[PDB]
C-alpha cells in the first residue's frame, strides 16, 4: 500500500516539505527522485516508511474558491471561497508558469475560478466556466 | 471484517487508486479482480491488509448537488451544492457511458441533480426529481 | 465492551455489510443471529473482533429531515435538511412495510413527513409527528 | 486516569450502554456500581479498560436549544437549535422524573450523545436590557 | 514532552477533572500540586502519564461570545455566539471573585466573554472599542 | 519524517509553548536550538519524539480575518471572520516589531487590515494587502 | 349625475359630517332623509350641489388590513396592513352591534377587515381561507 | 367630446353607478340604453352631460394580482397585488377562477376584469435564447 | 357646505394658520371664535369663504407613527413610520400639557391613561399637515395572541 | 396651446379614443388627421377644444418594463417592472408588423426584452437594446 | 386668506421664484417687502392675487433625509431618504452661514439628518439625534 | 406672477414643446425668445396665458438616478434609480456637447449620477460623487 501527499517545497538540502495524512511532513526522496525537478503543488506517492517514491500530477477534483488577486510575491494568490471566506494559498507551479499567454491555459486574472485544497493550502487548476446562458439552452433543449 | 473504498483510478499494473479511510491510497487488486472489468467510481473491498478483494456497485446514499457542466476532459463535473459551494468531482463511468441516450439513464445536462461524495471527489448517480406540485398534491390530499 | 453499528445490508453469505466506527465494514454474523430476519437500518452489536453479535431495534435520537420524495425503488427517500441541504438515504425497513395503511400512528410516507436520520450511516428510522404551531403556540401561553 | 461517557440504558445482564468517546459502547460496572440506582442520562466514570466506576450527576454546560414539543412516548423531545436544525434527543432523568416542561423552553442539549439534561431559566431582554444600560 | 488541560473540578483524594485532549478525564495530581488553591478554569500541565504537574494561568486566546446572562447559580452563564448559536458555560474563578467592584468589575450583560466552548468555560471579559473610534484609527 | 507545530511562548529553563497535531505542548529543544532567539508565533520543525530540531519562518498560506483592535496588552488582537465569528489571537512578533512604521510594505497595523490567522494555533502572522477592486476588476475585464 | 361620500357624523340641526373628494366636509341633508337613521360609515349619495339626497349601505370593495386590536373607546380599530403600516380606523355600525354573536361575528385580533383609509374606516370582516385549503383547490 | 367609465352596478330607475373620472357617480342612461341590460365592470361611454350613451367591452389592459379567493357572494375576490397589498374588487361578468390565477385589476375602479394565462418560463426561457 | 382644517397656529389679529385642501393658509376668524381656548392641533370647521367659523375637537383616526425623541424645543417630535419613514411633527397641545404625569408604574400592568410621553409610544400622526394628535396604547403581542387562538 | 395624447383606437366616423390627462376619451378628428394611417399607441396633439389635430411619432422617453410574455391576441404582452410588479399593455402597431425580422437592429419581440412603456397609458412604444454589463463598466473604468 | 411658499431667489426687478401650490413660480412682491434681504429658503406669505406681503421663518416640520454630502457650490447638498432614493436640494441660508462653529447649531457634516421639502427641492434645518441608547433607557426606566 | 416649464423640444414654426403643470404641451414663444439660442432642458418661463417668455437656465435640483448607458441615438440614456427602476430619459444639450473632454464637465460614462426630472423625462446635470472613506472622515474628524 502507498499513500499520496502534496509536494509544498523542495530544500537545498534535497528533503521536502509534503502535505499528506493531514499535515506538514518533512520527508526524504528515493533515490529514483531528483527533488530539484518536482513541482509546488504536485501529488506524490509516498511508501510505507514515508519516502517519496514517485512524483504525478495535480490533485484534479475538490473544492473551487474565486481568485481575488495574486500577492507581490507571485507566489501565493488570495482566494474567496462560497460563503465569502478568505483565504491565502500557494499556487501551484502551472498556474504561474511564466510562457502563459495573457478554456485554452493563461495568465491568471481576478474573478477566475481555481481548484484548491484549503488544509494542504494550494490551488492547483483554473476551471473555466461557461456562460449560463448556454448551459440554460443545454438543459432546456 | 472488511473494509470498503470508491475506486479513483486504475494503473497499467494490477494496482488502483482507491479513496478509503478518508484517503486517496495506492493498493494491490487481488486475483479475484478482474482489473478489465472495473469501473471508475465503483465501490470496492478490501480486506485487511488492504488488498482489493472484490469489486462491487456504487454508492447509493448521500450528498445531493446541481450538475453546473462537464469539464472539456469530458471526465469530471462542476457541481453546486446546498449552499452555492462549487466543486469539481469525477465522473463515474456509468454516468458516462457511450451508448447513452442525448426517469431512466441518458446522457447529463446542466440542471440535473447528482449524488455525490465529496471526500472522494465523484458523482455516482444522476437522482430524478418530481415536480414540486405533485408532491405538495400528495401531501395534502 | 462491545461497539454498536447500523445494518445497512445483508448479504447470501451471512456476513452483513455494517456501519460502525464512522464506516462501512462486511462483518461476519454469530451462528446465534438469523441473519435472514435482521432489518435493514437495525441497530447490530459487536464484539471486540466486530463479530454480529446481536440485533437491536433502530436508532431512536438523532438529527430531523423533510421528506421531499421516495426514489422510484421504492428504498431510498431524497430528504432536506435544515439549511437545505439535499440527500439520498435509505429507508429503514419499518418504513416501508408493505402492510401500512396510507392515511400519530403508522401509516406510509407522504412528501413533507419529518424523519429522524443518520446522515453519516445514511439511513431514515422513523417518522416524527409535528404539532400545529398555533397548538404549541397556544401551550406556551396557557 | 480515568475518562467520562453519558449512560445511555441499562441491562439485566450488568451491562449498561453509554455514549463515550464519540460513540456508543456496552459497557460492564464495577462491584461498587449500584446498577440498579443509575439514571437515564447520568454522567458516569470509566477506567481504562472502559469499565464503568462510578457514577455521576448530569451534563451542566453546553449547547442550547428550543424545546418544540415532547413526543408522544414521553420520553423523547423535538428541539429546534439555532440554525433551525431540528432533532430528536431523549429527556434525562430529572426533565421525565419540577415543572412539565412546555414548548418554548430552552434545555441545554448534548446532541451527539443525544440527550437533553436542564431547561435553563430566560431573563427577559428588557431587564438584561436595563442591567446593561442604568 | 506535557500537554495541557482545563481545570475543571478538584477532588479530596488527590485528583481533578480536566478538559484535555477533547474530552473530559479525572487525572492524578503530583505532590507538588496544591489542589485544593487551584481555580475552576485554571490550565494545568501534564505529563507523559495524564499527571498534573503544574498550574498555569488562563486560556488568552480563542472564541469570543456574547454575555446574555449569569445563571441563577452564579457559576454558569449563558452566552450567545457569533450565529446566535447559545450556550451554557461555567464562569472562571477571577470572573465571579467577590472583590469585585474599561478594567476589572463584575459582569453585564452584553459584555464579550473569551470562551472555550470544547472546555465549557469562559475566561476573561473583553472590552470592545467604539467603531467610530476604531474607524477614524483606520482612516487617518 | 520529521513535523512541525507553531512556537507560542519559551520559558526560562528553555523548553517552549508549541502548538503541533491540534493541541498545546511544553517541548524540549535541541541545544542546537538558540531558544530565547525565538520569535513568538515561528514555525518550528520536530521530531518523532517531539523535541524541537529547527527554527523556521512563520506560516504563509491559511484564513484570512479583518483586525478589529488590538487588545491592551499590545500581545493580543481582535479578529473578525467571514461569518462575524469573532476571535482573541496573538500577534507573531514581526506584526509588532517596535521599528515598524506607520501600503504594501510593512508597517503597524490599523483597525481594519486583513490578517493571515490560524485559528487554532490562535495565532496572526502576516497584514495582507488588499487592491481596490476597481482595480482588480479593470485586470479582469481588460 | 350625482357623488358620493362615507358618512361620518349626525349633528343636532340636522346636517352631517361626509368624507367626499378627498376631504371631510359638514354638509345638509335632502327633506328625503331621516337623519336619524343613518349610520356611521354608511355611504351616501350627494347632488352637485353637495347636499346629501340619499342613504346607502357600505364600501363593499377595497383594501384589506389586519386588526390588531379595539381600542379603549370600543368604536376606533388599530390595523396593520401590507407592509406593516399601522393605522387607527373608526368601526362602521355593522361592526360592533351590540347583538353580535364565515357569518357575521364579534373582532377578533388577526381578523381581516375591509378599510378605506382616506375616510378612515372599517366597514366589513372578509374570511380568510386556510393556505393548505387554498392550494389545493389550485393545485386540483 | 366623449369620457368613458366602468359600469359598476345598475338601479331599478334605470340609472347606473359608473366609476368614471376617479370617482363613482351615479349617472343616467340614454334612451338607446337597456340599463337592465348592461353587464357589471362594462365600459359605457359618456357624453357631455356624463349620460351613458353607449356600452362597450371590458377594460383590456393594467395592474395584475393573484386570486387568493372568491368571497361567498360569489361576486368579489380577495387579490394580493405585487407588494403583497390586499384588497377585495368586484368580480366582472365574465368572471362571476382558481387560487393563483392572475387577474387583470383596476383598483381605483375595485374590479376584476379577465384572467390572464402565464406560460411556463422554461418555455418562455428557451423562446429568449433559441 | 363647510370644509374643515388642522390649527397649526394662532395669531392676535384674530387670524390662524391652518391646514386645509392640503395647504398651509393664513385665515381669519369669526368673531364666534375665543381665541384663548385655541389649541394647536385643533380641527377647525371653515365656510365657503375660508373664514374659520367653529373650533372643535382632533382628528381621531389616520396613521401610526413610533416617537422617537421630542425635540429640544419641546414642541416638535422626530417620528417613525412604517417603512423607517422618520419625520418631524409639531406635538399637539395636549400631548405636551404642563400637568400631564408620568404614569402608573408598570407593575400595575396598564398604560392607557393620559402620561408625559417617551420614546417607543405610538403616536396618531397627519403627516400632510405635519401634527401629532394622541397616543395609542398597544396590547402586548401574547394577550393579543391569546385572543386570536382560544 | 394645444396638448398631447396617445391614440388608443380609431373609429369610421372621424373620431378616435385618446388617453390624455390622464383620462380615456372620444375625440373628433380635424380633416388634417389621415385616419387611415394612424398608428395604435401613436402620440397626438389636441387643441384647447380637444379637437385631434394632429398625428406624431411615438413615445420616446419614460419607464422601461421587462417583457415576459405576448398575450394569446398577439396586441397584449404581460410586463414585469422594478419592483416586480406586473401589468398587461397594448404593443404599439410598430412593435408587432409582420414584416419584422426574427441587438440594436428592429426584431420580433422575445421574452426579457426591455420596453418602454407608459403605465398610465397602457402602452409599450419601443424595444430598448442594453450594452453588457462588462462593457459598460469597461468604459466606465478607462 | 393667504397662502405660503419658499423663497427660491429674488430678481432685480423684485420680483422673486417661490414654490407655492405645489409649483415654481415668479411673483411680484408688496411696496412693504424688502426683496433684497430675503433668504434661500424662507417662508412667505402670499395674499389671494400671489403677491408676497410678508416673510417668515423656515419650514419646521415634514421629511427627515440624512446628508451624504454637499456640493462644490457650497448651495446644494446631496441628500438619501428613507427608502435609500437620493436627490439633490438647496440648503436654506442659515444651513450655510459662514459663522456658524464646526445639539447645538453647527456646519453640517456627512451624516446629519436633514429637515426637507422634497417638492420645494430644499433642506431647512438640522435635527440632531439622542442616542438610541439613552432613549431605551428612557422608555424603560 | 407666472409659471414655468421644461423645454423639451423646438419647432420650425416659433413654437415649443414644453412640460409644465405635470403635462407635454406645444407652446408660443414671444419676441422675448432667441430660439437660436434655445437648448433642449432649457427652464423657461411662462405667462398666465401659456406664452414662452423667457428662457433660464437648467433645474437644479431633484431626483438622481445612475447612468447606464447612453442609447444609440446619442440623445436619450437609459439610467436606473433607487428602487433599480430603469427609465429612458432625454439629455440636456449641455450634457452632450461636442466639445466635451474625457468635479469639471467631461464626456459621460456609465456609473455617472444624473441629476433627472422624471415627470419632463430629462436629465439636466452630472453630479459627481465623494468617496465613501473621505465622508466618513470628514463626519469623524
Given at each position: 500500500?502507498?499513500?499520496y501527499?502534496?509536494?509544498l517545497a523542495t530544500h537545498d538540502d534535497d528533503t521536502v516539505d509534503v502535505f499528506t495524512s493531514g499535515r506538514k511532513m518533512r520527508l526524504?526522496?528515493?533515490p529514483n527522485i531528483d527533488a530539484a525537478s518536482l513541482?509546488?503543488?504536485?501529488t506524490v506517492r509516498l511508501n510505507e516508511a514515508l519516502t517519496v517514491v514517485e512524483a504525478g500530477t495535480f490533485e484534479?477534483?475538490?473544492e473551487i474558491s474565486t481568485l481575488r488577486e495574486i500577492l507581490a510575491d507571485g507566489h501565493r494568490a488570495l482566494?474567496?471561497?462560497h460563503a465569502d471566506e478568505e483565504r491565502v494559498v500557494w499556487l501551484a507551479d502551472p498556474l504561474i508558469a511564466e510562457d502563459l499567454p495573457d478554456t485554452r491555459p493563461r495568465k491568471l486574472r481576478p474573478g477566475d475560478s481555481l481548484l484548491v485544497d484549503t488544509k494542504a493550502g494550494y490551488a492547483f487548476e483554473?476551471?473555466?466556466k461557461a456562460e449560463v446562458e448556454?448551459?440554460?439552452?443545454?438543459?432546456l433543449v
Open positions: 500500500p502507498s499513500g501527499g502534496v509536494l526524504t526522496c528515493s513541482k509546488k503543488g504536485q484534479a477534483v475538490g482566494v474567496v471561497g483554473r476551471i473555466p448556454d448551459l440554460v439552452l443545454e438543459e
